Amino acid sequence: GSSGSSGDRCYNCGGLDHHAKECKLPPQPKKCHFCQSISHMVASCPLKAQQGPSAQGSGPSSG
């Protein structure tokens, strides 16, 4: 049917043309927008820069 979004724009400066990600400006001092790690930021977040391009089954288990 006819569905859409309320309007998702760059939650940093307010750019509609570009996306928050593409945006260049520095990310607000808010909490990490990756792992909700209020401690560190998304710029330092280690997980973000995870090492290992290998994406062939990652320990397939439950619980």
Contacts to Zn ion by CB under 5 A: 10, 12-13, 15, 23, 32, 34-35, 37, 45
Residue 55 CB, shortest distance to Zn ion, in Å, is: 20
Q: Of 5 and 35, which CB lies nearer to Zn ion in the complex structure?
A: 35
The secondary structure of residue 63, as a DSSP letter, is -
Residue 48 CB, shortest distance to Zn ion, in Å, is: 6
Residue 51 CB, shortest distance to Zn ion, in Å, is: 15
Number of H helices, E strands in the chain: 0, 0
**CA-closest candidate to residue 34, choices 26, 24, 45, 23:** 45
Identify residue 32 by its one-letter amino acid code.
C
